[PDB]
Each structure stands twice: as structure tokens, then as C-alpha cells.
Design a binder for this molecule. Structure first.
Ligand SMILES: [Zn+2]
Ligand SMILES: [Zn+2]
Ligand SMILES: [Zn+2]
Ligand SMILES: [Zn+2]
Ligand SMILES: [Zn+2]
Ligand SMILES: [Zn+2]
Ligand SMILES: [Zn+2]
Ligand SMILES: [Zn+2]
Lengths: 372, 372, 372, 372
């Protein structure tokens, strides 16, 4: 498997696994990493929905950042300054729960710029992305204020770009040769969208969540990589959640995209490569889902799980697994020492600072060796 | 290792690892599980701070619920309706980041009662837990409002019990023979606290985060199990965070509790068993932290990592690892049907319902087979 | 998932994963665990072929014990004295490589009876199981003779029960109402067999390795659980091994059982449950293998991987995953202390015993403390 | 942690983990990977003893190849033809049990040259390495003869270089500017040795197994990397194996090298870096073993577990963890395939070949697609 090894002390070429941080990205290349593929029910094997897109022109994007996904993002060895642009398909916790963790961790770990967040509006102000992030920053005000005591607050801001969720395939970002368009999803209530990323002859579609709709098959047509929700079977709903049959059947027809519907949809789209996600990917669930899909779609398919990676180039769309460090660490970026705002008042009161314990004797031994 | 097997077809007794869901809790026993032991930097091997406490009277509490920790809590096979009470030591993201995932996950998992959260005030209103949780719920208003259309909203409520952070070892909870007391910490800014849980002659101490203070040594004294922050060494601050020598030194003295400070503290406390946490627990980090602690403390010690478990009985405090499913699922509890509230408006507009794709043909096959 | 929980302090019933050592085996129940499902190419995800069968009457058997598999066998928390009976399908390293690990490990771990091995003859004496194990014992004579100085040697014996590979579904083992039968396979050269285990109205078939043959579909018929070789695709041979097309084609026709052949076979057998094994079970291999089977077989199917388990009862054959300790330990059983032999010459010469370094000083401190 | 990233599309330099196959080895550099660190008791966390050594001149050696270690060796993406030279410290199953898996899997992984094995004599012919390997090859006669019909059998050979176990520090290998020296161990019976590898001004010492001896501290002096056995504490012997105190005490004096003896030895040796191995490296064992080493030795130390890696340079010896694929595959080398000799007997009878099942129909469909 992998490229032929030509040499005893050299590097193995075209490796059968993707080791994050080991492979340069070609100027006509895209890398997409599934940093979460699961559900609002949490699990070590699957973080909630998250995707990292890396373009050969050096731009990077996170599309969705659900609960748990930061552990996988952080295993990528990408500096925090290269991941400042996040697109949200919808405001479910399994699609933006870890925004706070990228916000606070990336700032404790030297992001110098503010985060930038694109997400949809709702039917009214309290149902949209601008309200959502504004209240998230208030929810975390203690964190924000205490950390801004010692770190310039500028990376602590979130610049929100809200767009009309009703818009049919309209441009929502246009920068440095890169476009995103959105269209609507049919999912729990008005607001949710899917995205298409256009750059340099490629199209990458992030379906978010939806029941099957008329918009996706139209605006996703001919994508290099087409991502779409694909649900657990009605039999699995009966077995895993003890649903009675009526309600089990309806989940796969009214509320979600069935495996058989996902097949219908990607048959219409004819992408280079289709990606099914948002099911629990276990030894007793996956096979009936892949069969549901094969009933109607025959093209190349990935059955997504965490740390699956796609390399998009002119000749091929290639699926591999990323082999990344469980014991992850922050990895430094180029950026320069950004200064705290020393007008910032302390958030301690003297009542608390009065309780400091004297540990001089306990610490003298290691201090003296370390200062030596 | 473990209890001796007595029969071919029987159960292996006193198993050398804890398999969650497989062991009865006796009436004079406590089980504590580390569901997060790490940092604001995410990694698959260590979720951020979270502790599950189970008492032999049937009460269960969560103390802290940091980013990523829900994946570990969910692997315990405890119905979400048994984990409704949550204690927060402070409002850093690595201590309450997964409250949202508990709130949303727990409600798709059929929690039927509101969450109940105890945490500290701050030095003004927008720095305490009541303000934080109230704005967390607004931040997720789309999630809340769309979910309540389909699921009775009573479980989607959060009753916050905000207590005075300034109070010195006061009761913040007292029910069914169980007491929680709080005292302050010194950490980033006013608000953070440590807890002591008292029940049936046991005392369990959850230190949260702090620089060394005069209160913990006094109010944790004699604990069966005492947990306290234990920082990565100043050499590791240089190696890993390429810090200059000066700021590397000050981290372990001013901002955080060094391993040597932790040993001094636990030497003052004389617990049956001390627990060091909140450091990256790796092959090249753990041993110098251990050595620092042993400079000043000789008693029983656990170097925390995720899914470590302590069983506290009259005769012993035992450390084990928990071996739990990575492919976790919600497990059902005994509660029942909440009679959904009819008085909730749909959050769809006709404009979005009009987009539904006809998928009758694609689904007819599985659909007619299933309806057997 | 799993049984409904009834009690805060109780055990979760009918758990959705199998924790080895945690479940009582009923009198009319069988448990089968895949302790290896892989190839002669090694890999942490998949040990080479091995199966553990546990019967409700207390009897346990290993069928195949390939390289790597003892790590999975050891995770089951089953005392060494309960696993003294081993059946080999054939004499490839990936089917008996860890026999020597069981022999040596289970003797240093208080096995007190000799191992018992059943395996096939070959066309001549040096091509059968008796010859193979006789020479395995000679290969490890240093390990044998040195161990026998300090441990009673009786359990270091291996009693081989060689049976006629040519026989057509004839008994090779009969004891305590348990029968094994053998029939031939077509695999590299004369010798390899498949087994059926009969007990208490159950039939479990262990296919071993073969190209498709007329015997398996006839003699496996109606099995409760039927295991058979199922090969990676001819396309996968070109991608993964760089086979030129024509050789890749013959591999799934002449030498191995194709996924499509596997499905024909199981269509003829009509087992209550089929098991495909002995392919690399990866995110980019498994789905086309499963499609292959489903071209011709529609019944219950497991795509085996390591630590998969089947529970066989009158009502159901259930597939689960086993969640087992990675940091495994031997667990003691109810045997009795066996007496060493003093008619045993030391394997040391004075030349070596004279090399001992005095270490009394370095060991003084711990030594004094331990003796109180 | 690790080196500073300088571009979005480029390669993370001096990575904090070692990804096998991702890094150039320099002309004055050595890489050592622990491919097994455990015991005769099997465990997924720890294969039995094995070491891979990659020299900057491009030579590679395996020192010990214990049960289970080939899963770790195969994760290094090194062509089988580069790993033909194997040194054994002694003939316990946990130091050479996976030789048969290197012999058989390596040969089908592509090795074209014989294996070459160096190991000690014993006190008589039947206690030596030559006898051991000649009888291992007879044990796998069925595998060898059946495989050799389909191949040139040249790679199936194993040439043994047996050397006297009694020799003090004498050359047993001297080739291409690499030297190995052996000297004796005190372990179970006459015969075990330790090795030193010298190349290009560096020295690496593989202790194997021993009770403490006068030869290791003399001939290992000044090593860049010194590896020695270091046993679990006597309290751990009582807790984990239920040894009575007296027997537990002696295990760490008479039979094995205690943690404290290990520290004295490494104190005497003064290596650039010491490695302790051959203990169960668990959350509840490793801290008491480390402390034992630290009573007597305070130089750089590694507490081995599996897939620990050392890079040796002039200016440093860096410990890292390797992050390698669990779903490993063979990787092809330059070595080109050879001409057989149309002259070996088939091992099939027509009795067996007449049992082939006609699967033409079930396979015709995929067969057609493939023949494009
Ligand atoms: Zn959603
Ligand atoms: Zn979702
Ligand atoms: Zn904090
Ligand atoms: Zn914290
Ligand atoms: Zn075979
Ligand atoms: Zn095989
Ligand atoms: Zn040994
Ligand atoms: Zn050994």
C-alpha cells in the first residue's frame, strides 16, 4: 500500500495514511478533513459535525464546529492563526458547540486576529446567528473579561457575517479567488443552510442537515465533493432507541434524509465523490446504510467517520484516514508578540488576593536549580 | 489481578478495571470518575475538567463539565435523568463548555426534569453563574425553540442556584443527607471556588482551579479524596510552549499551583488519597510532576487521567481505570413520556416546507419491506 | 441502546456492549468472541485468526490462535486453566503463531494441566499437526528446560490429538455432550480443514481458510453461526498490492473465496447468522466486500473484526462489540498450587552465577520498609 | 510544542510526534523504536520485547522480536527487505516468538533475501539459537513446503550466526562500519546475553533480560542509549499476582533487576540516556517504579512503552512517541521479484482439488466489470 519506497533513509512517498503536518499542499489541490461526523449524543469515536477545508492558495476554513470537534481540529498541527474563518450551516449544538473552545483556546494559544463567523439568520432576530454569537460572548463574559486582563482583547472579538437563510444559491463570501454560496435546508425550523465553496475549478458542498429538498440537487450539481446528511435506518431506530415502528418509519421520511433518499440525491448531483455523514458509524450500523444508498447511487462514495480526509486534485478525489496524535498539543504559527491593553482593570478584588498561601519553602529547591 | 474466578460460567469478581454499568454500588460506598482531566487546549486523550460522583444512597452529581467531557460521561451508561445536578467550580470554558451538550444531548436522550446547576457569583452581576447560564440559553435559542416544538420543554429549563463565591466553607446544597460546601479560589479573577461534598462520614474535595490559597488546606482537611490543580513544570513551559525562562518560572508561582505547592498543600490536608489533575498526562511530562509532588507529600496519590475511577469504602480508597465504550449510546432510565405541550408554534414557514424533494420512488422498496 | 436501567445503584442489564468477565453465561447459551480476524500481515487493529467459544455447560475452546491473538484472548479475564483446549484449522502462522504464547504465558500464569491441541494430518508425517507441535516444543526447548527447573513441568506438555484431514464431516472430538467434526478445505496444499461444534441443539461452524468447496455448504447447513473466509476484492489487490490485473483476478477465483463466492455459500448454508472474516476491515475496503456478499446472500451477516462477539440463544443470535482492557492482566482461577520437581538439574553453570552484582546498598531503603 | 510552522501549505518542521515514514534520517543520526516493552503475559497496550534500530548509513537491525511486536514493526512503513538482520538476546517466547511472523509475513510482504539471525549458544546444542531456529523451521514445514511450490524459496531460508554465550564483550558482527558485541546475562539458565551496537562514534546497549551483573555496568559505560530490564515492585507483585511477601521480596532480589538495582547500574554506566523496560506501564504501576530508579540514578531516563522513539545526534538524545497506523499495511521496496526453478512437487492431491465448488454464475457479474 502507498507509494513505493525507493530509499532506506528517505521519506515514504504518497503514504497510505495522512499524517497531519507531513504533506505540502499543491497549488491546484484541496484537503478536506472530517473533524466530526456524529450526533448530539456524544462519543469518543465521533465528535459532532466539523470540517476543515485547506485550499492550495493557503486559505483555510472550518465548516461547522460541533461539541468535541476541537480535539480532532487540534490534532491537525495547524496554527490557530490559520483557522480564523468559520461557516455555520445551522445553530444546533452539534454544529457550533465547540465555537467557544476555538474562541478561548485559540486566544489562550496566541491567535492574534478576531474569529470571523458566517451563519444564517432566522425567521426573527432571536432565531439567527448574530443573536446566537452575541449571547455566547455574554454567556462567557467571565472568561472574556478575566482573560482580557492579560491578553490583548482583539483576538477575543467575533466578527459575525449573518446572511439571509432564504437566499437561493447566493454568494455569502467572496475573497482571494474563493466563493461560498448558501441555499436553504428543511431541518427542525427555518434558518439552516448548505454551502458550496467555489475555487479554481473546484466545488465542495457541505450539506449541513436537511430532509431531502429541491435546492441541494440543483446547486450541488457536479461538485468535486458532495457532503450530505445520511440517517440510521428505521430498523436501527427500533433496535437502538426502542421506537415503535410508525415513528421509526417517519424519522427517515419526514424529519431526515434516508440512506435511500441520499442515494436518489447524489444520483441527481453526479459529483466526483459523495460523502454520507451524521450517522453513528459502528460495526452493526454502517452496512445497511451503505446498502440503502447503493439502491440508487453507484458513483464513488465515502462513509464518513472522524479523521477521514479527502485529497481533491485534477486527476483524482482520494479518501484516506488521518493518523493523528491523541495527546495533541498547540503548534506555533508565524505571528508576532501582540501587546496587552494595560488600561484594562484587574478582575481580582483585595478580598481574594488576601488569601494567597506562602509556598516559598516548598518551592525553593526547584526555583534555585531552575534559575541556576 | 482482580478477584479470583470461582466458576467457568460465572462473573469475574472485584474486576481489576471498572466496566461502567457492571457494578452495584453498596450503601456505604462512593464512586468518583474523572471524565475530564485536561486543559483549555483540546486533545482526544484528555477532555477538559469533569467529575462524576455516585453515592450508595443513589444520588449522583457532576462537578465541572468541560469541553469534550460529555463523550466520557456518556460512556458510563447512566440515564440522563440520573445526572440532573451539576456543580461548577468556575466559568472557564474547560469547566462548563459541555453544559450545552448535556442540556441538548440529555433532552434528545429523554431527560424529563430540568437541569439544576450550582455555581458561583462574581464581583458584579455579569461575572457570575446566573448571568452566564441565562445567556448560554439565549445563545442556543434556535436549538431550544425548534426542539420544544416536538419535545415538552420542561426538561429544556435550567434552574440555577447561584451562591456567594466570597463565602468561607458555607453550605450551598443540603439534601437527603448530602452537603456541598464552597470556599474561594485565586484564579484569573474573582468568582472561582472549590467544593467539599459530605455524606455518611465521607468527605470528597473538588479543588477546581487555583493558585495556592489559605482556605483549601483548612477546609479540605481529612478528606477521603482530595482533588487539586497540579501544574506542568516550568521546564515543560519552555520545551512545549517555548516560554522565556522568566515567565516560565512565574507561571508555577503566581498563576498556578506547582507540583511542589500541591505536595505542600496535600501534606497540610492529610487526605486518605490525593489526586493531581489539570496537566497534560504524557510519557514525557508525568514523571517530573510526580517527583515535584513527592518532594513535599508522601501519602497515597493518583496522577489523574481521563476515566480514572476511585472507589471510597470504610476500609480503602482504590484507584482503577474505567474501560468504557468509545462507540457510546444513550441508555434508557425508568422515567416516562412527558405529555408534549400542544401550545408551541411551528418554527417553519411555508416557503421552506415548499422545498421538499419527492423521494417516494427511491424509498418504496425498503418502505414496503419494513411495513411488515 | 441496551436494557432499560431500573435503579441508580444497580447494574445496567442486557448491556449494548460486552464487557468480558461481567456476564453470566446461561445453561442453554453460547458466546463466541473473534480474538483475531486478520492476515499473515500484522496490524494492531487485527490480530491473525483466533476464536474463543464458551458453552453454557462450562466448556471453552479456542479455534485457531494466530500471531497477535493472545493479547485479545488475555483481555477476556478467563483463567488460563479454562482455556486448555485448542483446535487448529491449518498450520499457517496466522492460525497457530500464538500457540507458543498460550503454552508459555499460561504455564508462567498457573495453568496446571497440559495444553490439548487438535489439528489435521497432512499427506505425510512432516505435513501434519503432530509433527508441527513436536518441533515447536523442540524450537522452544531453552524456554521449556529453564522453566521446568522452577515450575512443575506437567502443564508444559502439549498433548496433540491429530485427526485425518481427508475425513468428510467426521467426529474429531467427543466429550461431555460436545462434538467437533472436520471436513476438508482447498487451501495451499492438502491438510487444512473446517470445523463444526455441536452441543445442546446448536451448531457453530469455523471455516478456517479455503477456496470455495462442495463440502462446506453441505456440512455447515443450518449452522446457528457460520464463519467463512471472505477475500478482499480484485480491485483492492491492484490498489493495495499493485497486482497486475490478471493475477488480481485469479486471486478471487483460484486461491481464495471471493465476497461473491462467500454469498453463494451462505445462500446454500442458510445459517441463522453468517460471519465473513480474514480481510483487512478498513473504512475504504469493507463496503465493497459487503456489497459482494449481498449480490447473492440476504440473511443475517456480520463483517468480523477483532473483539466482535456473538451470543447464541434459542431466541436470537446477537452481534455486539466487546470492550476489554488494553492494559490486560492474567486473572487467577480456582485451581490448586502445583508442586515443583527437585529431581531437576539447574540450567545455570557457576561461570554465570559468579557474574552477580552486589546491589544490597541501592536496595537497602525499600527493602527495610517492605519487611514491615 | 514541536517546530514553528512558517506557511499555510507547507510542512510542520521537527514534529512533536514521530510519524513513521515521514522523516529523513541524517548521516550522523540514529533512530530507535521500542516495538515491544511488555512481558510473556499478552496485552494490546504492550507487545513483548522488540527494538528497531535505523542507522544513518541506512543499515537496520531488529534486536528481539517478541510475541505481538510485528504489529508495531509493520506500522513503521519500512520495506520487509530492509529488515533482514535480527539479533536475539535469548530464547524466551517474549524475545523471539514473532520471528516466525517476520519469516512468513515478511516473505509475502516482499522480502527477497533470506533472514539472518544472530543469537547465543547454550550450555548444549539443544539450548542454543541454531537448534531453536532449525526446529522452528521444521515446526512450520507445512507452511514452508506449500508456500515454496508457488515461489523461489530463497527468502524462506534463515541463516543463523550462533556465538558463544560465555564470551565477554567479543565482536559477533563487524560489517560496513557497524559492530555488535555480546556479553552474558544471569537469567533463568545459561545462555542469555546483552548486546552493544557501535557505529560512526555512537553506542546503543540492549540489555535483554538479566538479574544485576558485573558485565553490563562495565561494557555499557558511556552509551548514548542504554536499555535495561527494570521490574515491577514487590508490593505490585503482592497486589497484582497475590504473591506472599517472602516470595514477592525475592523476585526483585534473586530473579530480576529491581527499579533500585536499575538506578545503581545506570549510575555506574553514566549513559547520555537510560531506558527502563519490561514492566507493565500502567497508571497505577509506573510511578512507584520511576521513584525506585530515582533513589540511585538522576541522569536522563525514559520509562519505555510501545512505540516510544529516540533520535540520537551529536547534540542530543530526544525521546518522542510514534504515531503510526493501527490499520497497518505492507509497504513495497525497490527489491525486484526473482526467477524460480520449475522443479518442486505440488502439495495437493486430486482428492482435494476435486472438491472445488462451481461459483462461475455467482462471480460472472463482477468478473465482467473487472475485465475492462
Ligand atoms: Zn441539526
Ligand atoms: Zn446535526
Ligand atoms: Zn480555569
Ligand atoms: Zn481550568
Ligand atoms: Zn491459511
Ligand atoms: Zn489464514
Ligand atoms: Zn526472559
Ligand atoms: Zn523477557
Amino acid at each position: 500500500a502507498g507509494g513505493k519506497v525507493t530509499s532506506s533513509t528517505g521519506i515514504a512517498p504518497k503514504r497510505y495514511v495522512y499524517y497531519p503536518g507531513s504533506e505540502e499542499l499543491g497549488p491546484d489541490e484541496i484537503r478536506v478533513i472530517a473533524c466530526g461526523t456524529g450526533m448530539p449524543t456524544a462519543r469518543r469515536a465521533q465528535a459532532a459535525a466539523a470540517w476543515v477545508v485547506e485550499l492550495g492558495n493557503g486559505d483555510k476554513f472550518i465548516v461547522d464546529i460541533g461539541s468535541g470537534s476541537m480535539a480532532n481540529i487540534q490534532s491537525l498541527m495547524i496554527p490557530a492563526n490559520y483557522l480564523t474563518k468559520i461557516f455555520l450551516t445551522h445553530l444546533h449544538t452539534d454544529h457550533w458547540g465547540d465555537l467557544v473552545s476555538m474562541w478561548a483556546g485559540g486566544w489562550t494559544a496566541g491567535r492574534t486576529d478576531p474569529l470571523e463567523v458566517w451563519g444564517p439568520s432566522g425567521s426573527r432576530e432571536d432565531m439567527g446567528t448574530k443573536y446566537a454569537v452575541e449571547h455566547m460572548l455574554k454567556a462567557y463574559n467571565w472568561d472574556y473579561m478575566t482573560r482580557a486582563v492579560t491578553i490583548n482583547p482583539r483576538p477575543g472579538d467575533i466578527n459575525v457575517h449573518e446572511f439571509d437563510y432564504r437566499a437561493l444559491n447566493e454568494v455569502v463570501y467572496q475573497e482571494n479567488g474563493v466563493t461560498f454560496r448558501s441555499w436553504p435546508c428543511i431541518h427542525a425550523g427555518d434558518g439552516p443552510v448548505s454551502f458550496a465553496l467555489e475555487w479554481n475549478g473546484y466545488k465542495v458542498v457541505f450539506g449541513g442537515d436537511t430532509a431531502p429538498n429541491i435546492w441541494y440537487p440543483e446547486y450541488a450539481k457536479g461538485a468535486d465533493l458532495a457532503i450530505h446528511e445520511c440517517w440510521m435506518t428505521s430498523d436501527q431506530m427500533m433496535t437502538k432507541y426502542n421506537q415503535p415502528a410508525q415513528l421509526a418509519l417517519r424519522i427517515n421520511l419526514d424529519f431526515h434524509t434516508s440512506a435511500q433518499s441520499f442515494g436518489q440525491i447524489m444520483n441527481m448531483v453526479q459529483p466526483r465523490h459523495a460523502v454520507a455523514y451524521h450517522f453513528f458509524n459502528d460495526d452493526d450500523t454502517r452496512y445497511d446504510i451503505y446498502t440503502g444508498v447503493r439502491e440508487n447511487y453507484a458513483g464513488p462514495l465515502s462513509m464518513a467517520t472522524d479523521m477521514m480526509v479527502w485529497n481533491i486534485t485534477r486527476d483524482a478525489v482520494t479518501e484516506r484516514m488521518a493518523v493523528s496524535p491523541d495527546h495533541a498539543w498547540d503548534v506555533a504559527g508565524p505571528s508576532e508578540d501582540l501587546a496587552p491593553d494595560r488600561n484594562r482593570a484587574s478582575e481580582y478584588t483585595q478580598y481574594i488576593l488576601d488569601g494567597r498561601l506562602n509556598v516559598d519553602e516548598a518551592n525553593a529547591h526547584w526555583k534555585q536549580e531552575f534559575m541556576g
